[PDB]
Design a protein around this ligand. Structure first.
Ligand SMILES: [Zn+2]
Ligand SMILES: [Zn+2]
Lengths: 258, 1783
């Protein structure tokens, strides 16, 4: 048969199953219930036995058209007059200083900050194969940061030693994405902490031998998508442009669809 | 029996037995020298006996201090004081006094008043308002004179007196601040019958003064006896003591009135006679005898000449009466010509002196010419026609004595005390319009006349002359010095008095009506003489009490009143109830025949002219006959001054009444004095009649008639015609100016728009133009507009926004405000819908704010074209505003589909669950039909479901099933339940933790409002219970964090509460949850449980269910059937309402279920007391006094002993119960437990605790449905869903068979309630009001990029779903795609513009991409709004001080929702004193100011008068902490550090409730400054060694270092002054308080291939002694990281790490041990970096980042380690950077 869902609101009813408490309709009956498979029958019939396009943020709806925007209103007409000011982005400025660097604020809000990592390390950083990153400078941005692939083409011999180094830590069981891009923005990882090597040994001695540097980035689970973002590349700790940041977030939703 | 021993004149004899055919007890054998031309009797004389030793006079020294200060100290008290002082100053019982001298009356009056005041309370002489005494006066003159006398007599007490005499309805505030009142018996009667209110006066009178009750004999006595009976009945019904002191002059019978006054014969029957009067007030008894009136006139003017000639022979100065002002003139020249005749001028001219010349020049100043010619001879004229100035001149020349005879036409006798030697009454026949035909004068008037015959201690003989004819003189002689008993006429006015008593509600049935008759003087008069009142002596014999006759009179008058529909009287059981018509008739003192004539004549189609005929034909004008003299004046007036049609002509009485009214309207001038008096009489009458008729038509809902009646009433009391210019009501405008205006045909609007200079040029006077412009700008007006909100297919809900648009004048408009009547008039249908009263206040007009009103009107299927909403001023003519509301193409909501049928054939046993532990939480062995149906659709199929079962069905079981499903199938996931009420959250959490936490092996934990503590809370929660705001704050950021993706349930209770105002967060929470579920591909189930919803289809579509979980059940589904009864209680101003619904509440209790637990709710935080005492007082007269006391009294007496509340006595001792904001919320929980079983049997709720324990009951009456506070200055209805849920608490499956409830509301909305009490109420979104705020979060988190996606996001919201189905509710025009998308775009653009103006969003040049700002991000993180972050950015400036931080804290808009109690304006104002800072005195009603005062009180340790404040405190405190932290971040974003440190100090005060200006050690629990001297002295811990440090332990870190971890070997003895009561609190406070030392090392952060130098550790110890170690060789323009290792040093007794929770003795919530640490420079006053860290268990390292200027300067930075949740634990470390250039 077929478990019709009417619950007596579309047609008549029969006895409900005692085990499952499931209301059964007359559409399917005279047999075991679907949920638990026990015989169930009404009183009058058991007496005999007894006697023996698609927008980024939109849901499916019964609507002929989504609520598009119309700029004909005069309220926005006034705003267009004095909206000449704005569009000010600091981008990659070494002089930039948050001056409010509380850890809890950064991971709540994505500030668009991006970083450039060499492809042999960037691939393992974004796939989660490697857990700690090593750079000389210290970054107070402890929020979500994007990783841009380096422009230089990595040599095939570096992957051999990189794999050999991580055999004891990870092993050959985990598959490795040998397809290594270059100059893209495939990386998007969240940062939890940065500290010196001595404190890294003091507090995190288990995996400290993976990489050694004056300052250590500790990155948690990253994200992956199936589309590729071309980026020219910028020096370390650079603010991503609005257009790419908007597109990258949209792609993150499209991969979250799958 | 000779009452008392003082009374005199107990003697009589027989002398002649024939005096004009009558017997007159002749005192001293005076002779009657009757002759042909006149008849007279001689002057009686009396000789007082010499009082020697009977009584001694009272003085001032033998008094209390109040007696000393109140007394003015003349040291002389007359014999009256000596006689009366024993009982009038020591005893406190009713008494009466009767004297022929007013000086012997007023002194007794005020001494008795002072006696009552001083016996009322010891502090009562210091603080007033504990009593309200009232004085009565005959009419305005004596009322004003007594008011002035009391104002000037008693200054030191501070008592302020007033004079309200038929002038206006006194305000509640005025009588609240006033302590005593003065009125008139008519005004007192009308104000007592209209005294029905929230608070009345008769229960707090405590003393009532009567004067000259002798009027009872003549007229107006029915009013006095009615008010006396009313106050006596109030006294005997309130079981209190209210003294009654009566006063008169002389009574022929005094025992009858004494029994009527309820005074025993022996105590205070002091009767004063002519012997005991100070002066021998004799009088003549002259008469006249002539056959014709002309000879009568010449004869009695000759007689007047004769006795005034005798007076001039005597030489004293005398005064003569006339009846009319016009006739006094003709009498004046008659006397002048008589004096000139016969040559008796030689005995008449006044003496000449210098004072005579002074008086001559003074009168020469005056305008009056009659007095000019009267001065040379001995004549003077006194009248009320001429202004008061000449009255001063004549009264002072009388006082000095230049004048011999004065005529006064009876105004000064009432008004001004000017005694004269001889007084001539002339026997004038007053043409009293109440009687007509020149009725003879009353005894009270002539007695007051003789009162001035005795001039104080300059004349030894008092004389009085009476002139009249034979029958009149005999009649007068029979009631002046005879024993004829005073007879009252109460049967004629019996119907009106019964109607008034029934309207007041004091008299309800026949027996108490008979008792009230017995209370009146009529009963007492009937006892002595039954024959005179139609009762045979045999009928007296058969019934001594005359109860049968009283019953007969009562039933007859009740029949007469019921035949006129005034009252509803039932005979077969014997009770009469008041109706609206009877109440209206009683309120305005309208005779029953008048309202009968109304009912037989009035209709809804009368013109503007027949109203005059109706008002004229009424019978209070029937005692007016058209005379042959009046006909000429009447026809001339009809010829000239007529303005409208007058049916009846001039040949009838009502025709002449109509003509008189018409000529009085237009300020006409008339000749006949009698007709003038009649005109005034009918003017006042017809004014009150037209007001009553307007009220009647308004109640009958006749728009076209009530408009005409209101205009007519305005015309009559404004003395201006309808078509007259509105400017005519201003006296400043000259009449010729007004004529010039009307000759130009200009109107009010045209000249208001027309500019002033042109009107000045046209009128040729610029000053007049400017004055008329500023005057017309004062004309009341209001601009208003209505918005239509079609809630239902029939019932609508229109909102009116009104605002005054006129300049305010204090004198013109009045201090109180401006009244208005607003009604929804329909021209075609012609019946009013929901008329209403409105008051425009002072600040309402001044601020010109848009006052908003909301009200519901019904509509029909054929849509009316329009409804004329009209607002008319109740006092100003020609001030109306009409707002036509068209009904063009408004879309009405579609008819909702029916509910789902409830199918039940077999209950489901719990064993079907499948898990024994799961089912062990239950008690029943089977499932009720709702659970039987939802057992498998829930918990077995894993799909979102919406259930709308009625209350009490057991949706909690559905929540349990969902939680069991979550626990079973997905143990690794988590479950969260959302409830909209804090009390509901608390009770649900308690139930969950008792039932599932200890039994089932899962985890249950509540969530607080702090994101980072919620991190650890949600790490291992496994079950969460949250009010929606906290969960929304937790889930505000979801994109960049990954903790909430593992929850897969949302159980939302009371989803229908999404409709109202304080539940919009549910919509955004569900929308974001659906968004997350769709964009994560891990579906999250939604289970929405609530009551029945009519529009549940829209909510089902909102949650994305097609046919799976749609469960809507009709109200006839709950296991306990509910029966509701309909009842209406018409009334106004809610004043008769509480009495109206209180009466049948007990009758419902007995009829439905006597002695059964019932919960009631009428108290709006105030009605608790009134309801409790009225209920306990009413139930006494019943068969079972202890019906609600089925248990013993000993447990109740023990409970009331345990209860500390002072008001709860006599209520919990009885069965009356309550659960209010008091009793520290625990003992009332004990009485709730006592109510769980059948002991208490009744309780009253405050209607605010409707959500909570939900204890069952049987019968519920909805007596309180409205509430008024300081939110909008007006009453507003309860939410319909709130009322439904609140009433649905009735019923219990195991103690009752069915649930009972009834409705007690006024009739105008009873139909609306009946419409909505059965039909489910549709639910509508309210997301718009905060639509911006939520959007901020969704743009701060990066979920929104442009404007287009911001628009299309809203599709997920329930508001978008509901907008299409109900467009006209959301002001949307048409359902077309263009219209809806344009409206959505406009609304979202407005919200974005507001956000940008709040400095939160950046729109950019493209204008189509919105970027978040740091301020908006901060607001989103801390759960803030745009309007508060905007003000944060606006009023935050560098270098602010702590009071500025408190001020910026005060105006946070999150405090807007803080409510008011309609009384907080007083306690907040009084607690504003004794505080370090103060707020605006004019903003005490502002919720932000109240929250500021609350924060100051908490932070300065101040006591809060109302208990609820404490609760509010907690809420405020919570919000404060949040915004406080946000404040810091804003300052942290700005750049400067001084304000950051100030905000850190502010949050320290918030968490500690102290100040940084005081000592830090005060943060210790239970420590105050007064004992710090005990803390000031300090010796070394061990005794003997020399002091090393400061020898002081004031510093808290110093205290920690010195005491260490021991806290018992040193601190225990030094803190022994606490006597070990709470020393352990300080012990653990110090032990948990840690001390941390730090070490700082700066390390380079070079980019690459540089590596600079090695790590440079800089000593934390203060190093400035010319060492290069401090001077870090730092390379310029290089990022450098400061590693600070901070470690705690536990002394070893606690071993370190006891817990991770800091001690917060005053903060409600629990907060972790944070630590702030900042790096910045001080010379420039900016910071470089900020850090906050959590718990440092033993040691941690913090990594600051900082830069260096390119200038190679040797400068100084500083690191401050500040306490996040402590005080005084802050340390400073300066780093000296010698930055150098880098190559
Ligand atoms: Zn079916
Ligand atoms: Zn089954």
């Amino acid at each position: 048969r077929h478990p019709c869902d009417c619950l007596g609101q579309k047609h008549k009813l029969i006895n409900n199953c005692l085990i499952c408490g499931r209301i059964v309709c007359e559409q399917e009956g005279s047999g075991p219930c679907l949920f638990c498979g026990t015989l169930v029958c009404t009183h009058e019939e058991q007496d005999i036995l007894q006697r023996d396009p698609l927008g980024v943020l939109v849901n499916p709806n019964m609507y002929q058209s989504p609520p598009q925007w119309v700029d004909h209103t005069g309220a926005a007409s006034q705003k267009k007059a004095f909206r000449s000011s704005g569009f000010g982005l600091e981008f990659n400025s070494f002089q930039h200083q948050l001056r409010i660097q509380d850890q809890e604020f950064q991971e709540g809000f994505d500030g668009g900050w991006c970083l450039s990592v060499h492809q042999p390390w960037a691939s393992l950083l974004v796939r989660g194969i490697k857990r700690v990153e090593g750079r000389s400078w210290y970054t107070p941005h402890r929020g979500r940061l994007w990783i841009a692939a380096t422009a230089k083409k990595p040599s095939p011999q570096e992957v051999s030693e990189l794999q050999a180094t991580y055999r004891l830590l990870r092993g050959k069981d985990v598959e490795f994405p040998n397809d290594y891009p270059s100059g893209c923005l495939l990386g998007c990882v969240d940062l939890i902490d940065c500290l010196s090597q001595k404190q890294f040994k003091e507090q995190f001695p288990d995996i400290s031998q993976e990489s050694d540097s004056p300052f250590v980035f500790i990155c948690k689970n990253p994200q992956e998508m199936v589309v590729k973002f071309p980026i020219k590349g910028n020096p370390k700790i650079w603010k991503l442009d609005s257009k790419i940041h908007q597109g990258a977030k949209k792609g993150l939703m499209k991969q979250n669809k799958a | 029996h000779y009452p008392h021993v003082y009374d005199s004149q107990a003697e009589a004899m027989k002398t002649s037995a024939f005096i004009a055919g009558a017997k007159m007890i002749l005192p001293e054998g005076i002779q009657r020298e009757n002759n042909k031309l006149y008849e007279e009797v001689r002057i009686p004389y009396s000789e007082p006996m010499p009082l020697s030793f009977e009584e001694k006079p009272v003085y001032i020294q033998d008094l209390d201090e109040i007696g000393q200060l109140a007394f003015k100290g003349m040291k002389r008290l007359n014999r009256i004081q000596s006689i009366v002082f024993e009982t009038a100053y020591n005893t406190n019982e009713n008494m009466l006094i009767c004297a022929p001298t007013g000086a012997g009356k007023t002194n007794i009056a005020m001494l008795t008043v002072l006696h009552e005041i001083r016996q009322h309370f010891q502090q009562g002489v210091i603080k007033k308002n504990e009593f309200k005494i009232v004085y009565v006066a005959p009419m305005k003159a004596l009322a004003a004179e007594m008011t002035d006398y009391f104002s000037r007599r008693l200054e030191p007490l501070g008592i302020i007196v007033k004079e309200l005499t038929g002038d206006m309805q006194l305000s509640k505030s005025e009588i609240l601040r006033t302590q005593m009142l003065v009125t008139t018996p008519e005004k007192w009667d009308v104000v007592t019958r209209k005294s029905v209110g929230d608070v009345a006066l008769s229960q707090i009178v405590r003393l009532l003064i009567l004067d000259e009750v002798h009027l009872l004999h003549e007229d107006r006595g029915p009013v006095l006896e009615s008010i006396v009976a009313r106050t006596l009945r109030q006294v005997e019904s309130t079981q209190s003591m209210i003294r009654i002191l009566g006063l008169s002059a002389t009574l022929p019978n005094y025992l009858d009135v004494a029994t009527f006054l309820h005074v025993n014969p022996y105590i205070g029957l002091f009767f004063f006679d002519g012997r005991f009067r100070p002066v021998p007030l004799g009088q003549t008894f002259l008469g006249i005898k002539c056959a014709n009136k002309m000879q009568q006139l010449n004869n009695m003017d000759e007689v007047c000449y004769e006795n005034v000639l005798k007076q001039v022979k005597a030489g004293h100065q005398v005064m003569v009466f006339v009846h009319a002002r016009n006739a006094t003139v003709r009498t004046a020249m008659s006397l002048i010509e008589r004096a000139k005749n016969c040559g008796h001028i030689p005995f008449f001219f006044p003496t000449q002196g210098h004072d005579y010349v002074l008086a001559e020049k003074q009168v020469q100043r005056s305008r009056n010419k009659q007095v000019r010619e009267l001065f040379p001879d001995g004549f003077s004229i006194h009248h009320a026609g001429m202004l008061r100035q000449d009255r001063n001149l004549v009264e002072n020349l009388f006082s000095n004595g230049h004048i011999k005879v004065l005529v006064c036409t009876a105004t000064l006798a009432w008004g001004v005390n000017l005694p004269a030697h001889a007084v001539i009454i002339k026997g004038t026949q007053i043409y009293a319009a109440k009687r007509g035909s020149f009725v003879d004068l009353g005894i009270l008037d002539v007695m007051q006349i003789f009162g001035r015959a005795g001039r104080p201690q300059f004349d030894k003989f008092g004389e009085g002359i009476i002139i009249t004819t034979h029958d009149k003189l005999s009649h007068y002689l029979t009631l002046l010095t005879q024993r004829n008993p005073i007879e009252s006429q109460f049967l004629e006015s019996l119907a009106d008095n019964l109607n008034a008593e029934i309207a007041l509600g004091t008299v309800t049935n026949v027996e108490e009506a008979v008792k009230w008759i017995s209370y009146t003087y009529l009963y007492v008069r009937m006892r002595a003489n039954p024959l005179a009142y139609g009762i045979s002596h045999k009928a007296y014999q058969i019934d001594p009490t005359l109860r049968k006759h009283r019953e007969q009179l009562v039933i007859e008058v009740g029949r007469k009143l019921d035949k006129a529909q005034m009252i509803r009287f039932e005979e077969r059981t014997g009770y009469f109830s008041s109706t609206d018509l009877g109440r209206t008739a009683s309120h305005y003192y309208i005779k029953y025949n008048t309202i009968e004539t109304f009912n037989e004549l009035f209709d809804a189609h009368k013109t503007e002219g027949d109203i005059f005929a109706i008002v004229s034909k009424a019978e209070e004008f029937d005692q007016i006959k058209v005379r042959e003299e009046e006909i000429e004046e009447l026809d001339t007036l009809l010829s000239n001054f007529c303005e409208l049609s007058t049916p009846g002509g001039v040949e009838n009485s009502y025709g002449k009444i109509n003509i008189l009214l018409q000529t009085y309207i237009s300020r006409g001038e008339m000749d006949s004095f009698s007709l003038i008096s009649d005109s005034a009489y009918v003017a006042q009458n017809a004014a009150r009649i037209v007001r009553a008729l307007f009220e009647i038509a308004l109640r009958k809902r006749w728009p076209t008639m009530t408009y005409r009646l209101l205009n007519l009433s305005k015309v009559i009391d404004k003395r201006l015609w309808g078509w007259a210019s509105p400017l005519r009501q201003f006296s400043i405008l000259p009449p010729h100016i007004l004529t010039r205006l009307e000759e130009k045909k200009l109107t009010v609007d045209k000249l208001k728009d027309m500019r002033k200079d042109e009107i000045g040029h046209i009128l040729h006077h610029v000053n007049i133009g400017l004055k008329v412009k500023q005057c017309v700008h004062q004309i009341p007006s209001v601009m208003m507009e209505a918005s239509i909100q079609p809630i239902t297919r029939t019932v609508l809900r229109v909102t009116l926004s009104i605002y005054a648009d006129f300049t305010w004048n204090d004198q013109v408009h009045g201090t109180v405000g401006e009244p208005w009547w607003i009604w929804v008039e329909d021209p075609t249908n012609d019946h009013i819908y929901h008329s209403e009263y409105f008051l425009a206040l002072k600040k309402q007009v001044i601020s010109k704010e848009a006052q908003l009103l909301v009200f519901t009107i019904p509509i029909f299927e054929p849509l009316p074209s329009q409804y004329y909403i009209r607002a008319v001023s109740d006092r100003w003519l020609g001030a109306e505003a009409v707002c036509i509301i068209n009904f063009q193409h408004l879309i009405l909501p579609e008819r909702h589909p029916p509910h789902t049928e409830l199918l039940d054939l077999q209950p489901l046993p719990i064993t079907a669950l499948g898990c024994k532990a799961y089912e062990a939480l239950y008690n029943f062995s089977h499932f009720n039909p709702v659970q039987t149906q939802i057992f498998h659709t829930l918990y077995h199929t894993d799909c979102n479901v919406l259930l709308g079962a009625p209350t009490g069905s057991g949706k909690t079981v559905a929540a349990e099933l969902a939680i069991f499903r979550v626990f079973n199938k997905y143990p690794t996931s988590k479950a969260v339940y959302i409830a909209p009420l804090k009390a509901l959250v608390r009770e649900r959490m308690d139930d969950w933790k008792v039932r599932i936490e200890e039994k089932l092996g899962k985890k249950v934990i509540e969530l607080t409002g702090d994101v980072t503590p919620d991190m650890k809370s949600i790490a291992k929660a496994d079950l969460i219970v949250t009010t929606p705001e906290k969960w929304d704050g937790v889930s505000r950021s979801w994109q960049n964090r990954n903790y909430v993706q593992q929850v897969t349930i949302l159980i939302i209770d009371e989803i229908h509460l999404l409709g109202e105002e304080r539940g919009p967060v549910l919509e955004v929470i569900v929308s974001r949850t659906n968004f997350i579920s769709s964009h994560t591909e891990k579906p999250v189930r939604i289970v929405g449980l609530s009551t029945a919803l009519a529009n549940a289809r829209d909510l089902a579509d909102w949650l994305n269910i097609k046919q799976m979980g749609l469960f809507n059940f009709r109200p006839s589904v709950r296991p306990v059937p509910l029966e509701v009864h309909i009842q209406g209680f018409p009334g106004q101003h809610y004043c008769p309402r509480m009495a109206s619904m209180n009466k049948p509440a007990f009758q419902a209790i007995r009829s439905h279920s006597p002695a059964k637990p019932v919960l009631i709710f009428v108290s709006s935080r105030r009605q608790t007391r009134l309801t409790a005492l009225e209920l306990i007082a009413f139930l006494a007269t019943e068969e079972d006094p202890k019906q609600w006391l089925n248990m013993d009294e000993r447990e109740m007496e023990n409970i009331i002993a345990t209860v500390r509340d002072s008001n709860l006595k006599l209520t919990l001792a009885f069965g009356i119960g309550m659960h209010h904001a008091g009793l520290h919320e625990r003992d009332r929980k004990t009485v709730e437990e006592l109510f769980v079983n059948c002991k208490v049997q009744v309780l009253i709720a405050t209607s605010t605790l409707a959500w909570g324990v939900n204890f069952p009951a049987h019968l519920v009456i909805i007596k309180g449905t409205e509430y008024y506070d300081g939110k909008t200055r007006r009453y507003v209805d309860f939410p319909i869903t709130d009322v439904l849920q609140m009433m649905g608490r009735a019923g219990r499956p195991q103690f009752d068979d069915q649930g009972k409830a009834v409705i007690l509301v006024h009739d105008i909305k009873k139909d609306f309630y009946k419409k909505f009490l059965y039909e489910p109420f549709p639910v509508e979104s309210s997301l718009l009001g905060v639509l911006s705020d939520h959007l901020n979060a969704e743009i701060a988190g990066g979920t929104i990029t442009s404007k287009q996606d911001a628009l299309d996001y809203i599709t997920w919201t329930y508001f978008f779903r509901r907008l299409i189905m109900n467009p006209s509710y959301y002001n949307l025009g048409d359902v077309s795609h263009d219209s809806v998308n344009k409206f959505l775009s406009h609304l979202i653009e407005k919200s974005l513009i507001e956000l940008e103006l709040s400095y939160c969003i950046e729109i950019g040049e493209d204008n189509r991409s919105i970027e978040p700002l740091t301020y908006g991000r901060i607001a989103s993180y801390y759960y803030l709004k745009h309007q508060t972050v905007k003000m944060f950015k606006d009023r935050l400036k560098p270098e602010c001080s702590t009071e500025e931080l408190l001020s910026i804290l005060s105006d946070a808009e999150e405090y807007t929702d803080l409510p008011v109690r309609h009384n907080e304006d007083h306690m907040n104002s009084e607690l504003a004193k004794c505080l370090p800072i103060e707020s605006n005195p004019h903003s005490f009603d502002s919720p932000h100011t109240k929250a500021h005062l609350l924060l100051q009180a908490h932070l300065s340790r101040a006591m809060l008068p109302c208990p609820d404040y404490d609760t509010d405190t907690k809420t405020v405190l919570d919000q404060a902490l949040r915004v406080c932290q946000a404040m810091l971040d804003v300052a942290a974003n700005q750049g400067w550090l001084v304000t950051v440190l100030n905000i850190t100090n502010l949050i320290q005060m918030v968490i500690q409730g102290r100040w940084l200006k005081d000592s830090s050690l005060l943060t210790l629990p239970n420590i105050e400054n007064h004992h710090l001297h005990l803390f000031k002295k300090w010796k070394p811990i061990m005794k003997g060694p020399h002091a090393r440090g400061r020898t002081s332990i004031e510093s808290l870190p110093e205290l920690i270092h010195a005491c260490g971890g021991k806290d018992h070997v040193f601190s225990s003895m030094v803190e022994s002054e606490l006597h070990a009561a709470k020393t352990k609190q300080a012990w653990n406070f110090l032990s948990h308080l840690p001390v941390i030392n730090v070490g700082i090392s700066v390390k380079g952060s070079w980019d690459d291939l540089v590596e600079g130098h090695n790590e440079l550790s800089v000593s934390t110890l203060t190093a400035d002694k010319r060492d290069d170690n401090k001077w870090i060789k730092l390379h310029a323009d290089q990022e450098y990281v400061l590693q600070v290792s901070l470690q705690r040093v536990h002394f070893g007794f606690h071993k370190g790490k006891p817990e991770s929770c800091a001690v917060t003795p005053r903060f409600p919530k629990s907060k972790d041990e944070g630590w702030f640490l900042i790096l910045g420079e001080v010379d420039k006053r900016e910071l470089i970096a900020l850090k906050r860290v959590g718990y440092i268990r033993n040691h941690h390292v913090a990594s600051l980042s900082f830069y260096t200027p390119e200038i190679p300067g040797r400068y100084i930075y500083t690191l401050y380690f500040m306490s996040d949740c402590y005080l005084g634990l802050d340390q400073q470390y300066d780093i000296y950077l010698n930055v150098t250039q880098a190559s």
